[PDB]
Amino acid sequence: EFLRFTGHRAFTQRLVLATLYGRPIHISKIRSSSATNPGLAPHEISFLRLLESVTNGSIIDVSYSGTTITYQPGLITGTVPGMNASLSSDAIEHVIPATNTRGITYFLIPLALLAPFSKAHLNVRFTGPGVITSATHGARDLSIDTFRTAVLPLYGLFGIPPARIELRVLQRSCAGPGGKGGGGIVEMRFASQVRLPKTLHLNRRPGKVRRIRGVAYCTGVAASHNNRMITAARGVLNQLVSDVHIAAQYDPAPLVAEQKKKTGIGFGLSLVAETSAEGVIYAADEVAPPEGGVVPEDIGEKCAYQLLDVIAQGGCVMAASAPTVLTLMAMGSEDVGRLRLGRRVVSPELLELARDLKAFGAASWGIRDADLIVSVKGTGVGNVGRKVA
Amino acid sequence: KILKTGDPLIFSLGWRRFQTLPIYSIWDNRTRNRMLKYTPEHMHCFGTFWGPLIAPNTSFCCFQSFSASNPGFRIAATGTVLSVDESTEIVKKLKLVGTPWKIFKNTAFIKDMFNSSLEIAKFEGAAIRTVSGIRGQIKRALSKPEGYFRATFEDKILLSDIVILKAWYPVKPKQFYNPATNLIGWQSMRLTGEIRRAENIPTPQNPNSTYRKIERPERHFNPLRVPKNLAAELPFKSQIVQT
Amino acid sequence: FIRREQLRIKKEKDEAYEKKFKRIIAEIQNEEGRAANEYAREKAAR
């Protein structure tokens, strides 16, 4: 009830920083303008359910209008066998409903940056009708492949080792009828809980972009779609790079309940450019419209153009993974860590994250020239509960 | 002095001095976090209290009363903060104690344990045990005396035996928190001995609980009693000769 | 139902514990005995 926020922008960032700092928040006026569907969105209320499920002692209170919530956070326990599940290796089930338009990386990015600060492991299993493992048009969410091999190496940079991260899909799905729907189930297993993340330093220039590797996925369409997409993306990137290599993945169709239906018919592509210097990777994704039927070569050219855009633009980390690396840099020890952002990278979401950290109680950021070096002072919180044996 | 669970204790931990009342619990054999009733002499037990949260591996000291008229050694307990949590899992043994009513070869009827067939139907199939070591299982509620049941044991139990069922009842610590604001002034919660000496109530003592010396007579058993038909049917080389 | 669930959980938990600590004791004994035999070989050559 104490701290006060307004608006529906950066909602998951506000709740996750509230959980990590232990500061009780109160977010008012979610949808004041919308007369048709005011209040909380279904993906937002399902993220509230997931946050209650993985935490312990957190009290979430949604109002009668649905336009104001308050949130007194508790500790991030994870899957302990006395409170959350029955066994320590058991996956906590989470179902998200059929009226869900955002991708599953909308749930995975806050959970993956809230997961190294837990007590036990995290073994979340996202099932249900509305679990889209693809990119959305939506708010342009990342795919599962983009999310995995673009942002989990950043935890590898921080010292949360990716030897113990297990993000695996069991079915894959796109949106289907309109934006709503899904069907493809995932499970994420964080077994690498750290006390304090390392204060990293991204300062040297990530000049030579050495190679491009990627994933083109097709669920419900012909398997020549990814071959045509690979020929389009190679026709764009062969002017620049000799080694572009894009895996092809194909799944038949996922079935949801109504008597089951096959939903999530679509196809998309996800390129990742690896710089020879360090853990610096630029990613881009593009998905078919869930009703449109556009050319796969158009999609391959579109994702290659977005990848060359991000390679032109980015200093060290792209703006999709910049809030995650900046909030982990803030969670680290009481030293300064230095990120090298591009001047084009700075975004209203990044700026809103800065405003939220200043409101919560972290120190401000120091911006100097080198693209600009942003330097963040850690707050030294870490994780609160861990059994020091 | 030893220091009891439930009795308050002034913890010096962080910058905070705070009087809280803890729960002492051993980690039984790394299984269940069983609640003790006193701290063990010369042994680290776990404690659990409701205070401010501190990052673990933080050492602490622990006093009983900030008085100058203590004749010896004011500091009581030491240690280090193990972890922090909400809603701990402390567990205390509750033994439902009963008495045999009718004793057959294996199935014995057990009387003074439950009060109704609803309670027996809840505790159906439970691992019941004799004091002697005979295991057994609660089988079926008994109809005509309300509150008795049938339990099939391992071997024959005796009418002198006591039949226990060892359940684990959870114990939650209390959420009390005194700040030890000494420069302003503060109310110090007393200990149970000071409370009893002040308001004049004796300590509860059970005569069935106080240990005694047991006079065991030497166990002599009856001789073998061979039945008449078997003793008349077995052959000549092994026939029983009794004058 | 609680009987069947608790017996399944007890079997799975005991099997996982036995497997994990057999691995741990075997790895510790392997590394320590390897270094001890290497030191006994390097000491007997002097």
């Binding site: 312990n56 009290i59 209170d61 409170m83 599940a85 | 809603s87 | 139902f1």
Partner: peptide
């Protein structure tokens, strides 16, 4: 119901959804 309560024996706090 029963297995879920046996899993969340000691789990404090939850999302209070008034809508």
């Amino acid at each position: 119901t029963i297995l879920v309560e046996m899993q969340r024996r000691n789990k404090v706090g939850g999302i209070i959804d008034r809508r």
